[PDB]
Amino acid sequence: TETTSFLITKFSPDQQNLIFQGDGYTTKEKLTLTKAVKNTVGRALYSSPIHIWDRETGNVANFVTSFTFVINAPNSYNVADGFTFFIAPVDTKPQTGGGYLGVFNSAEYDKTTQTVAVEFDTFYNAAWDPSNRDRHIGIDVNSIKSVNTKSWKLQNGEEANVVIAFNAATNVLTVSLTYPNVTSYTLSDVVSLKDVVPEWVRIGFSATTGAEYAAHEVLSWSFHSELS
């Protein structure tokens, strides 16, 4: 048995258990991924690698993470590009920015990326996003074109509580986003972790801007995993 857990309900300016990439940094008790500026990327990784699956027994870890995040766009009508929670190899670095959200590089399935991300996409990219042009929650597996998505109305400036759980027995990854004014969205899909990501991974957040922009922030974060 191997387990990993942490809880940070307030971020300090010298948060040494996180690995920052791009414009990502801590300030005023909040983790800032990107400011409201064009063409940036911000990423934050928890320092310790997680044992997501066991090569020897073939076991896969059960896990759940919770975080509260806020998106502040100066113009409630022009918002881009989004925020994501992602599971990737330990040595992971920012990928394509803008619509790619700093985690992927193509709309085509690329097994070499070995990355699963749960996106909060705020800008319609015609080449791969849902035709309805709605902002949405989506589950990505080695591609920026989600395997499943769910419309979501962004409440500019409001904090959203997100819970992402993965059940090892069913291979179901569930996502839930709740706003206080009480509006909730849920989305599920079967992800076969053991065949997408390496057995040791790093988890983090990622947010990007492009021609359109907004400030992406995390105010608290917990994670708990258990590999038997």
Ligand X SMILES: OC[C@H]1O[C@@H](O)[C@H](O)[C@@H](O)[C@@H]1O
Q: How far apart are CA 53 and CA 168, in angstroms?
A: 10
Looking at 33-41, 45-53, 156-164, 168-176, which segment touches a second copy (CB under 8 A)?
Answer: 45-53
- Beta-carbon contacts of residue 64 (< 8 Å; ≥ 6 apart): 163, 164, 165, 166, 223, 224
Q: List residues near ligand X by CB under 6 A.
A: 80-81, 98-99, 123, 125, 209-212
The region of 48-56, 93-101, 128-136, 176-184 touching a second copy under the rule CB under 8 A is 48-56
Binding segment for a second copy (CB under 8 A), chosen from 42-50, 65-73, 113-121, 167-175, is 42-50
Residue 96 touches Ca ion, criterion: CB under 5 A: no
Select from ligand X, Ca ion, a second copy, none the partner in contact with residue 23, using the beta carbon and a kind-dependent cut-off of 5 to 8 Å.
none
Those residues whose C-beta lies under 8 Å from the C-beta of residue 211, and which sit 6 or more positions away, are: 38, 39, 80, 98
Is residue 140 close enough to count as binding Mn ion by CB under 5 A?
no
Is 104 labeled as ligand-binding?
A: no
| Residue 24 binding result from Ca ion, a second copy, Mn ion, none, given CB thresholds of 5 to 8 Å by partner type | none
48 binds, among ligand X, Mn ion, a second copy, none (CB under 5 to 8 A by kind): a second copy
Per the listing, tokens 């989004």 go with 82
Name which of Mn ion, ligand X, a second copy, none residue 121 binds, using a CB cut-off of 5 to 8 Å depending on partner kind: Mn ion
Q: Work out whether 104 is an interface residue with a second copy (CB under 8 A).
A: no
Phi, psi of 100 (to 5 degrees): -80, -5
Q: After which residues is the chain broken (C to N over 2.5 A)?
A: 181
Q: Six-digit token pair at 15? A: 């948060």
Find out whether 5 and 224 touch, Cβ atoms under 8 Å. Answer: yes
Residues that bind a second copy (rule: CB under 8 A) add up to a total of 25
Is residue 125 part of an annotated ligand binding site?
Answer: yes
- 2 annotated ligand-binding residue: no
The number of CA neighbours under 13 Å toward the Cβ of 44 is 23
CA distances from 102 to 43, 108, 126 (A): 8, 16, 18
121 is in an annotated binding site: yes
- Please say whether the dihedral angle defined by the alpha carbons of residues 129, 84, 149 and 195, taken in this order, is positive or negative: positive
Binding-site residue numbers for Mn(2+) are 119, 121, 129, 136
Which residues are documented as binding site for Ca(2+)?
121, 123, 125, 129
Residue numbers in the known binding site are 119, 121, 123, 125, 129, 136
